[PDB]
Each structure stands twice: as structure tokens, then as C-alpha cells.
Ligand binder design. Structure first.
Ligand SMILES: *[C@@H]1O[C@H](CO)[C@@H](O[C@@H]2O[C@H](CO)[C@@H](O[C@@H]3O[C@H](CO)[C@@H](O)[C@H](O[C@H]4O[C@H](CO)[C@@H](O)[C@H](O)[C@@H]4O)[C@@H]3O)[C@H](O)[C@H]2NC(C)=O)[C@H](O)[C@H]1NC(C)=O
Ligand SMILES: *[C@@H]1O[C@H](CO[C@@H]2O[C@@H](C)[C@@H](O)[C@@H](O)[C@@H]2O)[C@@H](O[C@@H]2O[C@H](CO)[C@@H](O[C@@H]3O[C@H](CO)[C@@H](O)[C@H](O)[C@@H]3O)[C@H](O)[C@H]2NC(C)=O)[C@H](O)[C@H]1NC(C)=O
Ligand SMILES: *[C@@H]1O[C@H](CO)[C@@H](O[C@@H]2O[C@H](CO)[C@@H](O)[C@H](O)[C@H]2NC(C)=O)[C@H](O)[C@H]1NC(C)=O
Ligand SMILES: CCCCCC/C=C\CCCCCCCC(=O)O
Ligand SMILES: [Zn+2]
Ligand SMILES: [Zn+2]
Ligand SMILES: [Zn+2]
Lengths: 118, 294
């Protein structure tokens, strides 16, 4: 584990993330340069979940008791896509293929453990 | 090749050869010969003076282990002397991608691996050429398996533009590969008349001379401990038809009987995830029943 240094992801729920991430990034700074390109959509608040979602992917949680990766649930992603994609579509921006939601576990499985709302 | 160099790499090399032995142990986990080999043994040559098919695999996978580990040693910040493959960096390798990153220095790993592993192959005899061959067979297995890995640094992460470098495959995949190379190795019948016959053999393929002993049987002269007292697999949800046969293969076909052994183990389980930040996993006592030859 190391501590979150990227601005957009500070105080989202946890202060500790690991590297490399699901996107295969060396430093948080390298990861930050890319997630910062979403800064508009965060301010627009097209989805409340987007900041949490983008941060669970670019700086996934790191726990000292649970050493298996912990991704966001499919439902969390499907809501951020629901809010953001139309607006992004309007400006010629496709919903990123890494952000795809079927690549994520659905909630309600002991085998597929994830992060979501009830 | 001076004792100052031999010492600076020796720690890492020993770790490497062990990885090779451990993977060999993995690949043959449920076979009659189960890699009863030590790291030490490939220096002592005790437990493998038998130019059998299986001795070929040991040479390759351990040579492959030394090279793999030190190539990765080099690439990470472990040796000051070697950087990585800076050659070809910066260039344009294809449509919408460029070279860069830290491509693994395989030629460095091969360099060291030859120094230690091929060193132990003392003698100018036919067996020593055989073993020398098998070393490179595993060594070049490590090289060929290298693949272009990439990171997409386009707009918003799009793979439109990307930086690539040349990376090692997972050592497992090298083990699986060399396992195959072992399964289809071939026997040789044979001073320069011998050295001719070895050059008629592809550098990738494994060479062996003697036929392999009955591995059901104990033969302390060969370092073979017999199949008795070995765990086998009976029941399993997702076991290879191979794995399901392990009990008949290791035990009954060898004359021995199949006994069960009740083991209780403690495993973290039944995990529930609290909202945000935390996950709390209670631990459970679980009963696993193992099987073995008696
Ligand atoms: C070349 O690369 C190889 C790996 O490819 C590398 O082998 C590994 O080296 C590390 C560093 O010595 C070993 O890591 C140790 O693992 C043991 C358990 O056996 C730990 O106890 C060690 O912990 C130390 O550090 C901790 C944090 O500071 C402390 O809490 C602890 O008290 C110890 O001080 C340590 O993590 C690893 O075991 C080997 N791999 C093996 C042997 O399989 C090799 O060292 C590299 N060579 C160079 C030049 O670095
Ligand atoms: C432990 O292992 C030794 C050696 O095993 C031999 O070499 C192995 C690598 C494998 O190729 C084995 O298939 C092979 O047997 C065993 O000793 C060997 O015993 C056999 C007889 O059972 C001998 O075979 C003879 O060879 C002669 C010529 O010298 C013939 O005339 C005979 O017809 C017969 O075929 C063989 O020479 C012998 N090897 C030596 C030199 O020791 C041994 O059987 C085994 N021990 C145990 C505990 O089982
Ligand atoms: C992560 O660190 C931050 C900042 O230290 C914590 O947020 C609060 O920090 C203030 C001091 O700046 C403390 O007085 C509060 O106790 C913190 N708030 C809370 C939630 O109690 C935050 O708590 C840390 N997160 C974790 C993982 O505990
Ligand atoms: C009016 C508000 C306009 C600002 C919001 C639009 C910016 C959308 C750009 C999205 C870039 C995301 C890159 C990735 O995907
Ligand atoms: Zn040898
Ligand atoms: Zn292969
Ligand atoms: Zn049973």
C-alpha cells in the first residue's frame, strides 16, 4: 500500500491505494495525468458516482487486511455511464473501453466481491 | 568471469535456480516422477546423472529460471551495471505506436545463466554436451516467449496512440512450454561424430540418451523415492481428467492402495463488505480430506 497523492481522488472514502493499477500505471502521477482529463465531468456532476468510480479504477483501494483486488460493482459503473455517456457522446467522446461495465462483477456473489450501495 | 562478478550475481542466481526447481515441481506435481530435485543437485549432479528424458527438463527449467529471474533483476533497480534494452527505444514500431518503456534485458539474463548453469556441466563427454544443449533449450524458450506489452496513453486512455516495450512472458507459461518440449523430446543414438549428432537437433528441442526408469519403483541409487506416501487427487469440482486419474496413476497402477487423511485447516472466508473504506473477513475451520498412496 501507498498513500493517495492524486487531487481528484483524495478523500473519496479511503486514503490508501496500490500500484500498478488495473490500467497498468507506474506512478500515481502518471495515473493522475489521465484521470485529470475527466475533471470537467466531475465538476458538471453528470453522475455523483463518477469521482468514486474513476478513482476505484485509476487508484483502486489497498487494504492491509484484504490483499485481493477490490473493484467497483457493475451497478456503480452503470450509473456513471448513465449520467456521463450522453454528455460525452454529444462532444464526440465514446465511453472508454476500459470503463466498460460487463468487465466488472455484479453485486451479490461471495466469489465476486465488489464496492457499491446496499 | 572474476570472483568479484561471481559473488555479486550469485545471490540472485540461486534464487533463480530455485524458481526453476519449484516450477519443475509444479509441472510434475501429480506424476510418478515429481521433480525430487534440489537446487544443489544440479551442481552435485547427484540424483540426476541419469541422462533420462526428465533430467533434460530439469536442466532447461533451471537454466530458464536463472535467466528469467536475473533478466527481471536487471530490469528492476537491482543492478547498477545493467540498464535495460535502451536500443530500439523511441523509434516507431507500427501504426499509431512507438517504442519506449523498459524492455527486459534478456541478453543479460542469458549472459549470467550461461556463466553459472553451463559452468556446472563439467566434462567434455557426450552427457555434458547433452546437458549443455538442454540448458540453451530452456534459455531460448525464455527468449522466444517475449511479447510486446503496451500501455494506452491516448486521449482519455484510448489505444489510438500507445507506447510499447518488449516483456517476458509469465514464468508459468515458460514452464508449460518446456513441459511440452519435454513431452516430445527425443532419444539420441551415438569424438566429432557425436558433436555432429547434437547439431542435427533443433536448439529448442530437449535431448536425452537413456530410457526412463519405472517411477513406480524406489531406486535409491538414482535418487528415486518411489510413489508411496504421495498425495493424490480423488474428488474435485473442476479437476482435469488428468488430475482425477492421479489416484489410479500414482497409487493403484503402482500396486499401492488409496488411503484418506482428515485434515482440519483455518481459512479466511464468508467475507462481507461494509460500505466504504473497509472489508471484514471472519475466519472458519474447514475440513479437507486428503488422499495418498500407502
Ligand atoms: C533479484 O531478484 C530476486 C527476485 O526476482 C530477488 O529475490 C528476492 O529478494 C528479496 C529481498 O531480499 C526477498 O524478500 C524477502 O523475503 C523474506 C521472506 O523470506 C522477508 O522476510 C524479507 O523481508 C525483509 O524486508 C522486510 C521489509 O523491510 C522486513 O520486514 C523483514 O524483516 C526483512 O528485512 C524480504 O522481503 C525475496 O525472498 C527474494 N526471493 C526469493 C529468495 O525467492 C533478489 O534479492 C534480487 N537481487 C537483488 C540484487 O536485489
Ligand atoms: C536402479 O537403477 C539401476 C539402473 O537403471 C538402469 O538405468 C536407468 C537410467 C534406466 O535406463 C533403467 O531402465 C536401467 O535399468 C538398475 O540397474 C540395472 O539393472 C538391469 C537389470 O534389471 C541391468 O540390465 C542388464 O543390462 C545387461 C548388460 O550389462 C544385460 O545383459 C541384461 O540383459 C540386463 O538388461 C542394468 O545393467 C543395471 N544397470 C546398472 C549398471 O546398474 C537397478 O535395477 C535399479 N535398482 C533397483 C533398486 O530397482
Ligand atoms: C484519510 O485522511 C484524512 C485526512 O487526514 C482523514 O480525514 C479527516 O482528517 C482530519 C484531520 O485532517 C481528522 O481530524 C478526521 O478524524 C478525519 N475524518 C474522519 C473520517 O474522521 C480520514 O479520516 C482518513 N481516512 C481514513 C481511511 O481513515
Ligand atoms: C458545458 C459543460 C461542458 C464541459 C463538459 C464536457 C467535456 C467532455 C470531455 C470529456 C473528456 C473525457 C475524456 C475521456 O473520456
Ligand atoms: Zn547439470
Ligand atoms: Zn509455448
Ligand atoms: Zn475418498
Amino acid at each position: 500500500c501507498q498513500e493517495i497523492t492524486v487531487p481528484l481522488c483524495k478523500g473519496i472514502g479511503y486514503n490508501y491505494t496500490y500500484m500498478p493499477n488495473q490500467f497498468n500505471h507506474d506512478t500515481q502521477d502518471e495515473a493522475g495525468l489521465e484521470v485529470h482529463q475527466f475533471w470537467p465531468l466531475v465538476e458538471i456532476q453528470c453522475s455523483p458516482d463518477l469521482k468514486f468510480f474513476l478513482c476505484s479504477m485509476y487508484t483502486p483501494i489497498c487494504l492491509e487486511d484484504y490483499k485481493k483486488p477490490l473493484p467497483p460493482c457493475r451497478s456503480v459503473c452503470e450509473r456513471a455511464k448513465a449520467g456521463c455517456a450522453p454528455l460525452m457522446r454529444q462532444y464526440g467522446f465514446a465511453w472508454p473501453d476500459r470503463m466498460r461495465c460487463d468487465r466488472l462483477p455484479e453485486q451479490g456473489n461471495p466469489d465476486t466481491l465488489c464496492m457499491d450501495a446496499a | 568471469t572474476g570472483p568479484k562478478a561471481y559473488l555479486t550475481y550469485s545471490a540472485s542466481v540461486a534464487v533463480g535456480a530455485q524458481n526453476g526447481i519449484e516450477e519443475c515441481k509444479y509441472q510434475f506435481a501429480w506424476e510418478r516422477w515429481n521433480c525430487p530435485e534440489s537446487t544443489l543437485q544440479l551442481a552435485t549432479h547427484n540424483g540426476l546423472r541419469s541422462a533420462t528424458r526428465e533430467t533434460s527438463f530439469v536442466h532447461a527449467i533451471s537454466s530458464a529460471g536463472v535467466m528469467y529471474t536475473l533478466t527481471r533483476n536487471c530490469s528492476m533497480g537491482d543492478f547498477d551495471n545493467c540498464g535495460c534494452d535502451d536500443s530500439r527505444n523511441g523509434r516507431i514500431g507500427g501504426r499509431g505506436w512507438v517504442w519506449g518503456g523498459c524492455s527486459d534485458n534478456a541478453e543479460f539474463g542469458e549472459r549470467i545463466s550461461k556463466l553459472f548453469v553451463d559452468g556446472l556441466e563439467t566434462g567434455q563427454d557426450a552427457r555434458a554436451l547433452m546437458n549443455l544443449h538442454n540448458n540453451e533449450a530452456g534459455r531460448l524458450a525464455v527468449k522466444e516467449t517475449m511479447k510486446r506489452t503496451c500501455k494506452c496513453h491516448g486521449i482519455s486512455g484510448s489505444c489510438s496512440i500507445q507506447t510499447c516495450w518488449l516483456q517476458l512472458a509469465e514464468f508459468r507459461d515458460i514452464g508449460n512450454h518446456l513441459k511440452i518440449k519435454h513431452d516430445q523430446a527425443l532419444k539420441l543414438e551415438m569424438r566429432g561424430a557425436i558433436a555432429d549428432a547434437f547439431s542435427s537437433v533443433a536448439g529448442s528441442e530437449l535431448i536425452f540418451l537413456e530410457d526412463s526408469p519405472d517411477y513406480c519403483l524406489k531406486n535409491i541409487s538414482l535418487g528415486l523415492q518411489g510413489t508411496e506416501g504421495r498425495e493424490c487427487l480423488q474428488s474435485g469440482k473442476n479437476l482435469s481428467q488428468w488430475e482425477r486419474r492421479s489416484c489410479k496413476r500414482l497409487c493403484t497402477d503402482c500396486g499401492l492402495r488409496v488411503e484418506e487423511k482428515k485434515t482440519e485447516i483455518i481459512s479466511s472466508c464468508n467475507c462481507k463488505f461494509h460500505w466504504c473504506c473497509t472489508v471484514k473477513c471472519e475466519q472458519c475451520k474447514q475440513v479437507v480430506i486428503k488422499h495418498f498412496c500407502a
